[PDB]
Amino acid sequence: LPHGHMQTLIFLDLEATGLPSSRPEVTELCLLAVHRRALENTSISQGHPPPVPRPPRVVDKLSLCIAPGKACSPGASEITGLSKAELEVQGRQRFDDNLAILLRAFLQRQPQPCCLVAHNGDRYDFPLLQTELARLSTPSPLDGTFCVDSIAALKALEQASSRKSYSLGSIYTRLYWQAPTDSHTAEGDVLTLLSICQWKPQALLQWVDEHARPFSTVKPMYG
Amino acid sequence: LPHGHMQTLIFLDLEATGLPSSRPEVTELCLLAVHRRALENTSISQGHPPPVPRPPRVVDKLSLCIAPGKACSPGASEITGLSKAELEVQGRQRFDDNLAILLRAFLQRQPQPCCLVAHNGDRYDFPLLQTELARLSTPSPLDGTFCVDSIAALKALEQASRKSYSLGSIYTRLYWQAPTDSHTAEGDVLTLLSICQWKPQALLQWVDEHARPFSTVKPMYG
Ligand SMILES: O=C1c2ccccc2C(=O)c2c1cc(S(=O)(=O)O)c(O)c2O
Ligand SMILES: O=C1c2ccccc2C(=O)c2c1cc(S(=O)(=O)O)c(O)c2O
Ligand SMILES: O=C1c2ccccc2C(=O)c2c1cc(S(=O)(=O)O)c(O)c2O
Ligand SMILES: O=C1c2ccccc2C(=O)c2c1cc(S(=O)(=O)O)c(O)c2O
Ligand SMILES: [Mn+2]
Ligand SMILES: [Mn+2]
Ligand SMILES: [Mn+2]
Ligand SMILES: [Mn+2]
């Protein structure tokens, strides 16, 4: 194990203004922190399909709307339900120093080591978050935090139980024969991700322990 | 009128170790922050019963489990699903200085003035929170924040339209449906949001009229 057993998994999702080529900015961020014990305690999935698992009782959750410096593209606004104008008239602040202080205090409540888990995190969420943080005067709150992409995890897990779509929704529906709730909201997508990670909790944890890498090594989306 | 128009409503709920006479400690806290515009934007309740309103798109949420210094009573544990032992084995921290910093930075993201809204807040949530904060070495993050009890609000609103004013009884009267996730902090906050969205304009006006400084709330115990 490269960095020992992860004590906390933080399921993470972002909404944003557009695609990577647009140099996008985060409009919404959700963190859901679960102790490894909470995950291993979800009862094994029986039935075909199994019921969507119960979320663990003990969770910490943070969900924030964030005013971007630039407009959301039409695609972003339509599917996320967020826009710059609406965020601003509801007094949302920018991704700023106070937000990093908030993230730091939130992370401090979680036992270490801690691992961020995000769907397609390696290509979107992690590089974008790094970019947002690098622009602040506050040091990164994620510097001692680990991270993993759940696409690769579910590829491994599904490979073993046994070409397929690994979109968040396709995975969820394949496992549970149910449409995801509140897709393209940060919180909604985090909850869907939690559910798919609860499918085979022990195997998911082991994969996470094996593949967790320092967030500090994630390259920014743009500079 | 007394402190102008509240720009943000923060719906709040707490779970705890027991009844007031037990000198209880918080085991769970949920804050849900909504701009007054988001509340005014929920479409008018039509039909009898009306559909449970849609939560606004734009919300900020914080939900935290907190290790108490003392054991939960048997009643608490059974109904809340939380205990000291389980909270501790999952590494939950106490209500401490870092928690206040977290609360402060969360509040700082909201336009002022800001008003806490809690069901029976005047008798339980507000005095307990005051007690928990007064224990800390960091000044209260709620010092410039206002607060109101949604029991009185819903009494007024429903009067204008003998009844139980338990959270679930109000919800069921309005929406003819049982609430979900009762006696979880977040579950109870969501239920409260739904009942406050019943008559958004009237609710806001009541809140504007009754908002009082949180700094004037007396601690549950010393
Ligand atoms: O592909 C994505 C995407 C992929 C993974 C995580 C997040 C996003 C995302 O947030 C996003 C995307 C596309 C658009 S687009 O079609 O309008 O240019 C958006 O506006 C937008 O916000
Ligand atoms: O492809 C998109 C997308 C495309 C067009 C407009 C909006 C989005 C979008 O909002 C989005 C997307 C993907 C993810 S995912 O791949 O990381 O599950 C998201 O979390 C997410 O919010
Ligand atoms: O009155 C409460 C109460 C009121 C408002 C918010 C939260 C609680 C609460 O959490 C609680 C209460 C009573 C008991 S008791 O009957 O077993 O002593 C509990 O165990 C317990 O957890
Ligand atoms: O009376 C209780 C109670 C009694 C015994 C065990 C547990 C609880 C409890 O958990 C609780 C209670 C009241 C409220 S309320 O009056 O503010 O809606 C709550 O929010 C809440 O969580
Ligand atoms: Mn995503
Ligand atoms: Mn998303
Ligand atoms: Mn309550
Ligand atoms: Mn409650």
Task: Write the secondary structure of chain B as one string of H (helix), E (strand) and C (coil).
Answer: CCCCCCCEEEEEEEEECCCHHHCCCEEEEEEEEEEHHHHHCCCCCCCCCCCCCCCCCCCEEEEEECCCCCCCCHHHHHHHCCCHHHHHHCCCCCCCHHHHHHHHHHHHCCCCCEEEEECCCCCCHHHHHHHHHHCCCCCCCCCCCEEEEHHHHHHHHHHCCCCCCCHHHHHHHHHCCCCCCCCCHHHHHHHHHHHHCCCHHHHHHHHHHHCEEHHHCCCCCC
| Token pair for B117 | 């809204």
In 3D space, the residue among B131, B144, B102 whose CA is nearest the CA of residue B14 turns out to be B131
Residue among A63, A89, A98 minimizing CB distance to B60: A63
- Ligand 4 neighbours, Cβ below 6 Å, are B 13, 15, 75-76, 79-80, 119-120, 124, 167, 183, 188
Beta carbon of B7 within 6 Å of any ligand 3 atom: no
Beta-carbon count within 10 A of B61 CB: 23
Beta-carbon count within 10 A of B69 CB: 10
CA angle centred on A186, ends A181 and A191, rounded to 5°: 45
Q: B11-44: buried (b, 16+ CB within 10 Å) or exposed (e) per residue?
A: bbbbbbbbeeeeebbbbbbbbbbbbbebbebbee
Question: Distance between CA atoms of A123 and A19, rounded to whole angstroms?
Answer: 11
| Token pair for A214 | 């320092």
| Token pair for A91 | 């007094």
Beta-carbon count within 10 A of A24 CB: 24
Residue whose tokens read 């019943």:
B198
| Reported resolution, Å | 2.2
Q: What residues pair up with B30 in beta bridges, in sequence order?
A: B13, B63
Beta-carbon count within 10 A of B205 CB: 16
| Token pair for B11 | 């719906």
* Sequence letter at residue A176: Y
Q: Which distant-in-sequence residues (6+ apart) come within 8 Å of B209 by Cβ?
A: B1, B2
Residue whose tokens read 């509140």:
A182
Q: Which distant-in-sequence residues (6+ apart) come within 8 Å of B168 by Cβ?
A: B178, B179, B182, B191
Residue nearest to ligand 4 atom 18, measured at CA: B167
SS3 A143: coil
Residue nearest to ligand 3 atom 11, measured at CA: B18
**What Cα–Cα distance (Å) separates residue A74 from each residue in A79, A186, B222?**
9, 18, 55
Beta carbon of B14 within 6 Å of any ligand 3 atom: yes
A100 exposure class (CB count in 10 Å sphere: 0-12, 13-18, 19+): buried
Query: What is the least distance, in Å, from the CA of A162 to any CA of chain B?
Result: 33
| B216 CA to centre of ligand 4 in angstroms | 24
State the Rg of chain A over Cα: 17
In 3D space, the residue among A149, A138, A130 whose CA is nearest the CA of residue A215 turns out to be A130
Q: Which distant-in-sequence residues (6+ apart) come within 8 Å of B206 by Cβ?
A: B148, B152, B153, B156, B157
CB pairs under 8 A between A and B: 88
In 3D space, the residue among B119, B77, B69 whose CA is nearest the CA of residue B96 turns out to be B69
Residue nearest to ligand 1 atom 14, measured at CA: A18
Q: Which distant-in-sequence residues (6+ apart) come within 8 Å of A85 by Cβ?
A: none
* Sequence letter at residue A88: E
Residue among A61, A90, A111 minimizing CB distance to B61: A61
Per the rule left: phi > 0, alpha: psi between -120 and 50, beta: everything else, A47 is left
Question: Distance between CA atoms of A65 and A46, rounded to whole angstroms?
Answer: 37
Q: Where are the alpha helices (DSSP H) in A34-185?
A: 36-40, 74-80, 84-89, 97-108, 125-134, 150-161, 168-176
| Token pair for A222 | 């743009």
The residue of B26, B36, B57 whose CB has the most chain A CBs within 10 angstroms, and thus the best one to mutate to test that interface, is B57
Method in brief: X-ray
Q: What residues pair up with A16 in beta bridges, in sequence order?
A: A26
In 3D space, the residue among A143, A118, A120, A126 whose CA is nearest the CA of residue A208 turns out to be A118
Helix H or strand E segment including A117:
strand A114-118
**Contact state of A58 with B87 under an 8 Å Cβ cutoff:** yes
> Of the ligands numbered here, which is closest to the C-alpha atom of A72?
1
Question: Distance between CA atoms of B141 and B9, rounded to whole angstroms?
Answer: 16
CA angle centred on B69, ends B63 and B72, rounded to 5°: 75
* Sequence letter at residue B83: S
| Token pair for A165 | 């779509």
| Omega cis (within 30) before A220 | no
SS3 A125: helix
Q: What residues pair up with A137 in beta bridges, in sequence order?
A: none
Q: Where are the alpha helices (DSSP H) in chain A?
A: 36-40, 74-80, 84-89, 97-108, 125-134, 150-161, 168-176, 186-197, 201-211
**Which phi and psi (to 5°) does residue B29 adopt?**
-140, 130
Q: Taking a C-beta distance cutoff of 8 angstroms, is the pair A114, A213 a contact?
A: no
Chain Cα centroid distance, residue B28: 11
In 3D space, the residue among A42, A46, A17, A16 whose CA is nearest the CA of residue A29 turns out to be A16
Beta carbon of A76 within 6 Å of any ligand 1 atom: yes
Characterize the bridge pairing of strands B114-118 and B146-149.
parallel
Question: Distance between CA atoms of B107 and B157, rounded to whole angstroms?
Answer: 28
Question: Distance between CA atoms of B207 and B203, rounded to whole angstroms?
Answer: 6
| B173 CA to centre of ligand 7 in angstroms | 18
**Contact state of B57 with A82 under an 8 Å Cβ cutoff:** yes
Sign of CA dihedral B91, B96, B99, B103: positive
